[PDB]
Amino acid sequence: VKFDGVRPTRVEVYLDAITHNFREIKKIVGKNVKIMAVIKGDAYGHGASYVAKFLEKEGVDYFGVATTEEALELREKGIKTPILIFGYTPPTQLRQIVKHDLTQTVYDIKYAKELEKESLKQNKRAKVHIKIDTGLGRIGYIDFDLAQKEILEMANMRGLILEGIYSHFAAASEDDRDYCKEQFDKFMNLISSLEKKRLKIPLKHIANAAAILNLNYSHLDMVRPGIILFGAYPSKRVERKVELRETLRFTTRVVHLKDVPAGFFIGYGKSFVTKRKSVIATIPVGYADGLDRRLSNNYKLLLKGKYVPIVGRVCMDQCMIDVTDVEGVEIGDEVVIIGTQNNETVSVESMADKIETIPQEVFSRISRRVPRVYFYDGIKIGEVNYLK
Amino acid sequence: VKFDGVRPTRVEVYLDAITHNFREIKKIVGKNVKIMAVIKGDAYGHGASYVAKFLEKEGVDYFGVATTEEALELREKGIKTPILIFGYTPPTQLRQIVKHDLTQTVYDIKYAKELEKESLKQNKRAKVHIKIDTGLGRIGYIDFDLAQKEILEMANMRGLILEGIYSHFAAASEDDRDYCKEQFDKFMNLISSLEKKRLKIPLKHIANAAAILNLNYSHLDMVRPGIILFGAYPSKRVERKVELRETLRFTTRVVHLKDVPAGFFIGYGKSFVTKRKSVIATIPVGYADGLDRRLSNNYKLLLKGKYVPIVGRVCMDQCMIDVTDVEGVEIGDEVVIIGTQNNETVSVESMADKIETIPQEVFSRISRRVPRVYFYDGIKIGEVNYLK
């Protein structure tokens, strides 16, 4: 329909497409290789609640998130699946991760002790994964000699469970195979040293989407697909042997149509002027919704399967488009910003290229003001308006 | 304190600075000119609930929001101040705006008739403000002959209250005096025509923030400050001295520290490498939080009042800073992304410049995941976490 209870400007999340892309990852990896769905940044702007709910039905082995509150949000909504927090959970918030049984990242002994203390205080055991810095220079142990010592102590701390150990590739998306091979070996060399001290950590993992496609050796015990679950690739230097489906459609509606003559100025600073008789539509989406202002006078959106350019500057809440070439335009016609419309697509990757970034940042730009509508087998099954 | 119950990456909102900036508008305009506080985009990322709550106590005459959902959000938190919705409320949602006495922007008879029908059905009257396009080419009547014809119809529509009439400047920020007088004159000429048809409208307004300070003639009955209320100037080219106080501080904490030698690669794609023995810190803020990825290797955050460069790529939830030259850096030290720290400011305007946009987009990019902590008179009075 033209309009409904939900805001005109919206994100349509296709849950059956996410579960499909998830099933594509299982084909690439072995039958005994576990999958951790990275759904950080609110499932890359898709809404963690619903995405986690539907991946839990699909039988996912783990979830990956960036923060404590991301991990807790999932538990608040009845997610039973194990969850791993990549980031630092401050000492002041340690009670919560122990209470709701959340896996925590650890790469120093003082922090492990503080966690153990809270684990013993609640008479539960805090699952932990050890992060190793094999080249990325971000987080994890860099002194491998120190790492062995502290990791071996943690193995003897009864308040903890030393379930996992992991690292992260620095240039897998850039396809520096020599560095990926180099990072992998360092990682395995630390594990060999630990296994020689009678310590078998059940979950060794290192591969993100880039290495999952290319580096069959990096699979290990568990694999960490993120953006790839949402119908996009991390870069152009990947094999793309999987068949991805479109998971998100960022859409809005025609809210106003005017006929104007030539020499008619549009937008702030009179940055655009018509060179002909034109039909201008206004659409209630702007930069506060996640439509980058740099697309002012250099992007085309989809309307009835035709490309329509943004004319004038992108405002905070709205922008104008030239619809002169499109016949039969009406109030409440759908306008697609990201995604497919009638044998035509303005993909998330195309948008990322135009503003010199990657699909992950584009998805994360879609703001709180944009409600998420959810679909499964073609039918709408729920919605979230964050303004509520 | 180093850490607390709130996420380390946060936005500190200073409500007394917002009210102070509002009072700066009060000094500029008369005692006889009303003030509509524009707080669309969740109060430019400050949080509409708390900001509206305090501007109401301050005695603001009206609020301006972009969308229906923003207006209902205010009403649902108990706000009684009159609220204007700038954007388009679709025919499907007209019941709500009549029920909660929200003011609706109208610029066509068909829509007026639709709004009146619901208004009559509830035995109520819908307050409306008429948008006039005088040059911006965004929304409103461009046909001033029609404008008059349809407005006189609306005056004889007993289910509508024809409270306001307004337009908007296209280049008040670029300081285009001629085009501003051109816009104003058209508006006032239209006003004069309507009076001769025996029709007066009590709330005439046109001045956005730039026109408030530079164009004294443009004050009329009401004025519409937005970005000025949040400590950012609406133009670079402004006259009139004003005392703007800093309303927002986008801050994070040091999470990891490490010593590294020269030739140490940092971040994705090995984009940065050390030229010396260095001390590098990791901070839990990324582009999913609104820190633009294009700041990778070309911005400086503030730590202990000193500038520290961002090194390597900005990740989705984190990035690294070079802290070598800063002494006594410990875990939990405050890093300011936007705002003031020890006689030193990294303003929202400076970042807007850096990523070639305007302050409003910078504030708007600060994502759902970043909690808002609120202050009044130096005391922390509350907090909101949208993950909850």
Author numbering:
A (entry chain A), B (entry chain B): 1 to 388
What does the paper say about this structure?
Alanine racemase (Alr, EC 5.1.1.1) is a fold-type III pyridoxal 5’-phosphate (PLP)-dependent enzyme that catalyzes the reversible racemization of L-Ala and D-Ala. D-Ala is one of the key building blocks of peptidoglycan network, an elastic polymer layer consisting of sugars and amino acids that forms the bacteria cell wall, protecting cell against osmotic pressure and attack from L-amino acids targeted peptidases. However, the alr gene encodes an anabolic alanine racemase Alr, it is expressed constitutively at low level and essential for providing abundant D-Ala for peptidoglycan biosynthesis. T. tengcongensis MB4 contains two annotated alanine racemase genes MBalr1 (AAM24437.1) and MBalr2 (AAM25327.1).
In order to understand the biochemical properties of AlrTt, especially the role of the non-conserved residue Gln360 in alanine racemization, we determined the crystal structure of AlrTt in complex with L-Ala at 2.7 Å resolution, and investigated its racemase activity by saturation mutagenesis of Gln360. Like typical alanine reacemase, a homo-dimer of AlrTt was found in one asymmetric unit. Each monomer covers full-length AlrTt (Val1-Lys383), it contains an N-terminal eight-stranded α/β barrel domain (residues 1–244) and a C-terminal extended β-strand domain (residues 245–383). Although we co-crystallized AlrTt with PLP and L-Ala, only L-Ala and the phosphate group of PLP were observed in the active site of AlrTt, the pyridine ring is not interpreted due to lack of clear electron density. First, side chain of the key catalytic base Lys40 forms a hydrogen bond with carboxyl group of Asp317’ (2.6 Å), disrupted the covalent bond with pyridine ring that is necessary for forming the internal aldimine. However, these interactions are disrupted or much weaker in AlrTt: His205-Arg224 (4.5Å), Arg224-His168 (3.5Å), His168-Tyr268’ (3.0 Å). Thus, side chain of Arg224 is not properly coordinated by His205 and His168 to adopt an optimal orientation for stabilizing the N1 atom of the pyridine ring. The short side chain of Gln360 disrupted the hydrogen bond with OP2 (4.0 Å), which is highly conserved in other bacterial alanine racemase. One L-Ala molecule is positioned in the active site pocket by hydrogen bonds with main chain nitrogen of Met316’ (2.6 Å), OH of inner layer residue Tyr287’ (2.8 Å) and Tyr268’ (2.7 Å). Presence of Gln360 and conformational changes of Lys40, Arg224 and Tyr44 destroy the hydrogen bonding interactions necessary for stabilizing the pyridine ring and phosphate group, result in weaker PLP binding and low racemase activity of AlrTt.
